[PDB]
Structure formats: C-alpha cells, structure tokens
Point group: C3
Chain length 445, copies 3
C-alpha cells in the first residue's frame, strides 16, 4: 500500500515501512527433457554444399552431446548445495534404472506430463525440444545410405535453429559446472515458465504474483544438470515457493552519528548495526543482512530465507527506543567522523562532519538546503539530489510520506574520555557496562 519512512534524529537511522514481503520457504522442482538422437557417425562420400552444411551442424550436435556427457560424469560441487537438495534428489532418482524410461513414456504423446517417480514425488515433466524425432526423420535419410541424400536448404536452416537451443544450454551448463542461476530463457522460455506457473499447486493470486514477477522468479531459481541417458537429456529446474505472502517488511538505514567538536581527535562516533531488510515471519522477525538477498518491486519485496537470521520481534524496538531493555540494541563505535550520505526509500540521511560541504538541491532551484555538522535528513518532496563533498547522489522520487522524528543525538550522552571507541558488535548496555568499569578504575584512585 503506502510506503512511509521515519528518520530518527537521535540515532542517525531511518526505517522505510509499508512493503509487502514474499519469503521463499519451499521449492517446486520440475524435470525438463530434450529428446536426443542416438546416432553414431554415418559418413558417405558427400560434397554438395548442402550436405556439408548438414554434417557440420551435425558434428556440433554430437560434440554438444559428448560435452554434456563429460559434464555429467564429474559434476563439481557448488556452495549452493545447501539449497538444491530438492532437485539433486531428483537427479539421483533419475539415475535409477527404468526411471528415465518412465518419463520418456509419459511424454511420448504430449509435451507436458505429471510423473510419479519411484520415490513418491509427483513431479511435473516437460519435453521442450524433440531432436530424436527431427534427426531420425529429417536428417538420417540424408546420411545413412551408400551415398548421402540431398537436403533442401530449408532443412539446413531449420536444423541450425533447432540445434541452437541445445548448443546454448550446453554452454551455460558447461561453464557453471551444471548449476545455473538465474534460469535463462534457454533453460526455460518465458512461455514455458509461465505455463509451468499455471500448472503449479498454488492459489490463483500466487500464480498471478509469480507471473507478474517472472524475472525475480528467475533470479531466485536454479537449473541443475542431471543426466544424458538413453536419448534423453534431463535437468531439474527448481522454482521458489513463497510460504510467506504479504508479510509486513521494512528496511533499516543507518549512518554514523558523531559529535561535532571543532578540535579533531576529540570526537566520538556511533552507528547502529544491522541495517537491511526485516520481515515479520512466523511470530519472529527474519533479518536479511546481505543486499542481494531481497529483490524489490514497488511496495513488494522478494527474499530468500536461506541467508537470513531469525530475531525476536522485539528487535523492532531499536527503532522506537534504543535504550529499551526488552532488546539489547547494538552499535559500533569509532572516532572516524568522515562525511557520508545514505539514499533511503523516500529521502536521504546525511552525516556531515568537519569542513565537508553538504547540501540538498532541486533540479530547477539549485541548493535548497545546507546541512550543518551532525546527522540530518531530508525528504524527497522537492529534493532531487544530495551532494556530500565531491559526491552527488540521486534521491528516489517514489511517492510516500516521510516523518522527521526529532530527538537528542544519543552520542551526546557519553563522556568522551571514557567512551569505548573500538567496538564492532557491541550492545548499548555493553558500552554502559564498559563505562561503569572504566569509570571505576579512575574513580577509586
């Protein structure tokens, strides 16, 4: 719905709320087959240019098949093995004797078919390319005689077109050791992906969600190479199942909060930690520290719980009361008052220190705001750019309401002499306990 933002002057941090999240909690695997032609070289005296073109493209087909064979003989392990057991188990099932013949029988008359494997998985299989029928019907009469038959020029062009998808799949599967993500249109055409979404056991609003966000679905999918066996090329496509839908999500933005003394070396800094995406999830909060783990479209966020931490919901209280005992709100400390800016969803946080020239401009009016020393904020309403030193940032012009929450910078509550300026993952209460200990070593003496 409405994206809103809140800047907290006291902690030099902002929270962008109103996003609807879709968290991946499951996988839906599907088998993708390509019917190949088990042919061995058939060479006869041929020299007309059309026969040469056919044998050349046919050698590129045989090399693609042998390349897929040496790729499946030794498949290198990936750091994603912890996220593909749902498809690797299917490659292991297909290696069973008689199972590849089962899917070859189910896709004998139609392109799509549900197949109950010998492990209880009712998987959906597809035959996206039929080269055994094309090579054995249109090409073999040309190459398996005493002298080779002459093909028409339309066949030469049609065979380069059909063989092309095989060659490109062999390129992607070869350079990535059998595991590719995102899933390209060569692995699965957009038409095939959308048709696979319609056949998926999900609600119509959820099919509409994945169909309206097919590129995000591709970036969160996997293509795993299985086996080439018995005139069958098989590989597993692992598509995301979003077990969490429309859950509230928010993005925390943090920036250094320093004191603004005029004598360098007498200033202390503080920055809230754990900036990133937060989503309500099953009575707790799912936190995503890495930036590429959440894809954003307008008000909607698509995250993968694979690289998340699970935090108590009280972690949100660091945004309303950071000194609050229900949650130990952590900060990092330093004496590095270097100017910077953070572009948020509806504005910009500016940490200006020293002699830095910080400003906020409108495209037609020029400079409309000059920041003084400290941490401040400006909304995108009327602001186009923000300059900090020699750097110019662009402000997101997305509609929403910003709220400037005034408050005393908490860095002012600390005596500089006893401040712990060296903490990376330290608590508010951790710093207060270190201050009680450093004040005790000087107070008693």
């Amino acid at each position: 719905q409405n994206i809103t933002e809140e800047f907290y002057q006291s902690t030099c941090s902002a929270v962008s709320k109103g996003y609807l999240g879709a968290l991946r909690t499951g996988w839906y695997t599907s088998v993708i087959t390509i019917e190949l032609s088990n042919i061995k070289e058939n060479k006869c005296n041929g020299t007309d240019a059309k026969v040469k073109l056919i044998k050349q493209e046919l050698d590129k087909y045989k090399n693609a098949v042998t390349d897929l064979q040496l790729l499946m003989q030794s498949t290198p392990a990936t750091g994603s093995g912890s996220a593909i057991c749902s498809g690797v188990a299917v490659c292991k099932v297909l290696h069973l004797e008689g199972e590849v013949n089962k899917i070859k029988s189910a896709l004998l008359s139609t392109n799509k078919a549900v197949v109950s494997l010998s492990n209880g998985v009712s998987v959906l299989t597809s035959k996206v390319l039929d080269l055994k029928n094309y090579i054995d019907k249109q090409l073999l009469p040309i190459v398996n005689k005493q002298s080779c038959s002459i093909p028409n020029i339309e066949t030469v062009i049609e065979f380069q077109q059909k063989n092309n998808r095989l060659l490109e799949i062999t390129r992607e599967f070869s350079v990535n050791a059998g595991v590719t993500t995102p899933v390209s249109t060569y692995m699965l055409t957009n038409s095939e992906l959308l048709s696979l979404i319609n056949d998926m056991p999900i609600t119509n609003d959820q099919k509409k969600l994945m169909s309206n966000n097919v590129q995000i679905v591709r970036q969160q999918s996997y293509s795993i190479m299985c086996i080439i066996k018995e005139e069958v090329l098989a590989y597993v496509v692992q598509l995301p199942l979003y077990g969490v839908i429309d859950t509230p999500c928010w993005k925390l933005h943090t920036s250094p909060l320093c004191t603004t003394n005029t004598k360098e070396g007498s200033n202390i800094c503080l920055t809230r930690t754990d900036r990133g995406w937060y989503c309500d999830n099953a009575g707790s909060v799912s936190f995503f520290p890495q930036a590429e783990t959440c894809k954003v479209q307008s008000n909607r966020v698509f995250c993968d719980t694979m690289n998340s931490l699970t935090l108590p919901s009280e972690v949100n209280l660091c945004n309303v009361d950071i000194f609050n005992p229900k949650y130990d709100c952590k900060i990092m400390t330093s004496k590095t008052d270097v100017s910077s800016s953070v572009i948020t969803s509806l504005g910009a946080i500016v940490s200006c220190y020293g002699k830095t020239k910080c400003t906020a401009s409108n495209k037609n009016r020029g400079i409309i705001k000059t920041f003084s020393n400290g941490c401040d904020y400006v909304s995108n309403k009327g602001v186009d750019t923000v300059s900090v030193g020699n750097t110019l940032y662009c402000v997101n012009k997305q509609e929403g309401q910003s709220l400037y929450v005034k408050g005393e910078p908490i860095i002012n509550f600390y005596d500089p002499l006893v401040f712990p300026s060296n903490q990376f993952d330290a608590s508010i209460s951790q710093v207060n306990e270190k201050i009680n200990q450093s004040l005790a070593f000087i107070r008693k003496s």
Copy 2:
C-alpha cells in the same frame, strides 16, 4: 607522464604517483529507439518450408515484444537507483502522452536526431533498427492474404539477422530487470557508441579520450529499459561525463609492519589503513576504497565519484610524515604476523615474518634477493617474480622510477606490553592517548 613510486620503510607502505585521472561528475543521457511492427497474428494455410521458417521467426519476434511488455509493466528496483535518476527521468518523460510520437516524428526521415522533450532536456535520439518498415514491407504481403505468399530464401535469412538484435536485447533486459551495465554491443554497437561520442557536447580532446577508451566507457555506462509503446521500443543509455580531467592521482599500497622477535606472542603489528586510489579533486582529495571503482589504462585512471569519500588534501601527509598533526593518520593493530606480499605499480612490498621463505627472482638468474624478517621492498628493475611461502607473485614490468625511502619502522617506537593490539579504525594519536591511559593505570600503582 612518468609513473613513479615511493616505498616508505618506516610504515610498510608505498605510493604510486604520476597517473592522470578522469572522474565521472555528470551523465549524458541518450534515447535509443527500435521501430517495431504492430501486428497481430495473421495465419493462413501455409506449409511450404519457407513460410514455416518465416512464421517461426515471426513468433520469436512476437514473444520478444510481449516479453518486453511484461518487463516494462513491473520493473524491479536496483541498488543503482542513486546513479540513474538522469535516465529514469527520461523514461518517466517518455511515458507522457504524445512524447513518444515526438521522437517518432523526429526520426521519421533520418536515424539520428536531437529532440527537445517536454521537460527542457535536449536529448539525442537514435533509431538503431527499423523493424516496422521491414516487417510491414517484406513480411506482411507474405502472411496477410487468404493463402500466404511465398518468400524467397534470402528474406528468411535476412529476417533472422534483423530479428537477432531484438532477441538479444530482450535477453539482456530480461535477466537484469531492465538495467544493464556495462552496455553491450547489442545495446549499442561500437560504431553507434563512437558516433554518439562525436555528437556529444564535449571538447575534441575529450571525445578523443572516450573514443580511445570505449571499453572503460561501456563499463561505466548504463542501459535502462523505458517503454514499448506505439510501435516504438525505447531505452535510455546513460554515458559518463568526466567533469574532472587530467587530475593528479596516486595509489596507496599498505602491508603489515610487525616486530621481529623470536618468541611468538611477543610481537605487535601495525598496518596503515585506507589503501587504494586518491585523486586531487576540487580543492579536496577523492578517495576510492573499492577496487573496481577505478579502471586503469597505462598512466590514466577512470574513477566514478559515486563510491568515493571526500578527504582533506592533508591526507597526503600520511605518506611523508605519519606522526604529523595536520592530519590524524589512522592504522589498524594486531598481533598477526603472517607473511604476505603486495604487488605495487613498479615493484613489491614484502612482509616476511617467522620462518617464511621470502625471495625475489629474475627469470634467468634465479633468486636475486632474500628478504629477512620485517617489511621490505624491491623494484621491478631486474625482478620478475616474488615468492612468499608457497605463493609466487608476478611483478608488473611497467617502466617507471622507484625510490626506496629509508626510515626506522615505527612499530619499534611502541612498548609491547601497553600496545593496543585490537584496533580497526584507530588514529596514531588515538593509540598514543590509549597508551597514556594504560600507562597511567599502572604508573600510579
């Protein structure tokens, strides 16, 4: 001009000077159009192989158009939004009613044309592919009758060639959610990029600079998908404007500086922080901490100010006097004396500790220098490789002059017992103040 280097034995750091910098300070946006054919399926009884090939390639054209349509319906946000407002504003301008008709009229007779949009931007537009003219003139008479007309085989091949650039642009725009960088030759041919440079409002020496460094220009450019509307495919190419030209730049190299005691656990280490590229910029220094933010060609550096910090010019005094009060020169401390080497522009810094076998060799003479324990340096004059433990590095054979600046290692000025061995972003004066405080807790008692 002449690249020179200076190794500082006192701080285990080196500075490579003499580079001429080109910093990005602006964007030059340009609209790239592809005239499409608004056709709906026209199917008649056709079976000759040439008609089938034409309808097959025509279906791949219709799917590319519908794929671009679902890509433009929901465009996922990128982390680069802070750097593309200059082009996103044009996509927003094109969505206005009547504006796409304006550029369609300006490019009605010619390929290139300057167009004054309805927002005051005099942008340069180009028509790089004309599919409406080709489909409506060469293909529609073949498919919009009672029975389909027969095309010659040259047309089938020419249509696969023309439709190819559309299909590849749809692949790049699809997998990257509409924002690609670098800009491929499919988005913009080298001929089109060089012609776009000649038409750019810049000096002839600056056009010669971008034309001689077109790959760096591509890596620092963006291609943003706009709209497919009214037989027009439009997307914005955002090219860099280097507001800073020929500015002096230098690269700081740092390596751990430890003491060389024979009893492990009694040694302290120190490393200068903020290694990377520095450029003089508008009365201050622009620092680039990330390595991929500066592309290097011979004596020339191309940086993006988007990921830079602005520092006072006194930051250079950490290279001549690190104990100098005009700038608080920061270090990080530890007790981790692990051997390593850093390949600089004209030589190699070697930090050798413990039992590590450190050496510098010439390809034909073998080992020409054996490093003892501590931090040392060797020039590329006569040296080909440097070995530290089981690792062999290659020395850059670029011509320049190295200067070995002798000096006492500053790690020797510190009493080990009271050294702060746990600092990440700590100042020289910060460590000295912590030493005055740790000496006061034991001195009084």
Copy 3:
C-alpha cells in the same frame, strides 16, 4: 578415498578430511591464432539479395577486425596482472618484428605447431579458424570485379557460420578489456582444449586429471588478447599447471560458541577463526581463506596458490588441542549469541541460543532431533534437513564417516566479568594475557 569428518564439541568447529588436492604452481601458455583477411572495401553495383547478405556479413567482419584493433591499441590493466605475466610476456614477444611471421610460417601447412620464440620459450601454437583462406578464395571473386559475382546460398550460410566465432570472441574480448576467465568454448573449444591437454608436457595421469575436470581447468585459466597484425589474430591462453598433486587437504568449519545463561547480557561468545581449505604443501600448510579459490569435485580439491597464505604445519594442532603452545590458536570474541547453522561436508553444526527453535529432520520421519542451547552437531546419517529459526538448510548426502569428539565447551573456562568481548584477530594466549592484566587492575585494589 574416504571422506571423514570430526566435530569438536569443545570449540564448536568441525574438520572434513580425506580430500586429495591439486594446487596450481605453474602456468602453461599457448598461442591461439586466427588467420584473417587483409581486405579493404571492395564495393560494386550489387543488389541481388545474396550479394547484399554477403556484403552485410562482410561488414560485420570488418567491424570485428577494427574493434579488435582499437582493443589492442589501449588495453586496460586488470587486478589479475600478478597472475598473467606468463602470457603477457608472450604478447610482448609477439609484438616483435618478424615473430608473428614465424608462427604464421609454422602453421602454414598444419593447424598445430610448436614454435621456439625469440625469447627461448617453446610455446604451442594453434590455428583454430582460417578466414584468410576462406575470404580470399570464396568471397573475393564475388566482390572484386567491375560488377560483383553471384554467390550460391550455401556460401552465405557458411560464411555466417565461420564469421560467428570471430564475432563472439570479439564480444568477450571487448567487454573484459582483453582478459577473460574462465575461458569459454569460443576462446577454445572443448575439443581444442582436450587436444591441447594431450600435447602438454605432463604425466598421463595428470592429463587424465585435467581432461576429467575440464570445467575446473577453464575456471582457472586465462585468455589474454595480444595483437591483430599482418592477417593474424593472436591471443594467449594460460592453462594451470598443478605442481602439487594428491596432497592431503581438509576443510575447517567454525561456528559461535556462547554460554547459555538465561539473562541476556551475561553471555560471552567465542569463534575460531580461519575457516576454509587447508592443504599440505611443501613442508608447510597452504591456507585458502576465500571460498571461490578452491573448486571441489567429490574427494578432490583444485586450489590456486595465488590467494593463499603459508602457515606452519602446527596450525593443524588447533583442531586437536586449541590450548596447545606449539601454535597460537586464534579466536574472535563477542557477546552476540545469535543462532546459526553451518552445513559441513558430512553433517551440520548448530549454534542455538535464546528462544530459537533448532531441529534436525528426516524427510519421512519429521523432526528427529531437537537441539538445546549451545553448540552441537548432527551427522548426515538419517538427517535430511536442519532448521534454525525460520531457515531450513539441506544437509549434504555424501557418504563418509562422522566422529563426534565430546569435550567441555572452552567458553566455560572464562570468567564473564573479565572476558575480552571485543577481539577480531586475537590469540588464545592473547586473551589469557589480557585476562591476567584485567585481573591485575582489580586484584591489587
């Protein structure tokens, strides 16, 4: 042989042993040539569709040649320069006058040939594409007359096929500033790579190793653009030489080890540092901290010593006795008891703290183990998944034997009040010395 694992309950760490390593210690360079046609535009009045198709593809050939020329005029430096001196030296040798004519003479009658350059390097050269013969024999009679001769349609298709590899090599060399890795099948076909392996001065078991792991060989190879000169396109392929073969390797996995008090803020944490791959190497241990520097296939590991550290073999004693004085076993400390899990080679380490719901399940039985608070471990025997909070990990189903080494968590030997909770690269003995100093400031008073 047999992959085994050992979980150390005392340190919340696991070691996966039994891997056979192949470390890169050398480079084998090879020159790859493409015979080009030195032609200038030859235009005559031509309009038959076949002549147009030929001149169109011929312009794409001329632009690929001029694009390679502006790519070789200014070649941008890469961060890999420290790993390609073995090939850059060959590009520098080829630029000598008369040397490109030497390899052009050796490959005058055959495709492959060993050439002794004028620098003592007996390099192996290959001619993978012959465009000078094809353009000058099949195309020039069509375009160098008063009126252009008419080519047959097979030639138009064959020329688009031959020119395709040139255009794709120009794309890869253009966007990557002349240095590509991995080496694609366009730079070197799998047939050409395997044939190049057979011709390499190595043992038959080592040729069998690289031939069975060609994708790992590609990912650890470089393609460097040299020169386009005198109807010759030359570029260097740098293939890895594994000077270390079948060396024992092991992977260290680490996870936070905290105390499990019921009052938050009273808990201290500890984590072993330096997780990653270790290999026995030349009397020392080669450590690889980055994850992408070692490619794994079953029991075999392929590492690059370029991004490794050399450690004494006593570093393995951190796995059997971390309090052992022969090696200073380092840890990092904090008070951040956030739950997490690490998927190992044969199981999973689980660090469960607070209210987190940690469990281990079997696909058909459901939850088979509930972890209590602390650091624990479960083998893959009977376990399919592990859930920590809202995150589900997949356990690797690889066969091997796990050993649970019981022991007291070492975090319990520390008094919380005087624990140093702020260390990043700190030693066991470092923490004990800081504890002796913090106990001395309170003990005397």
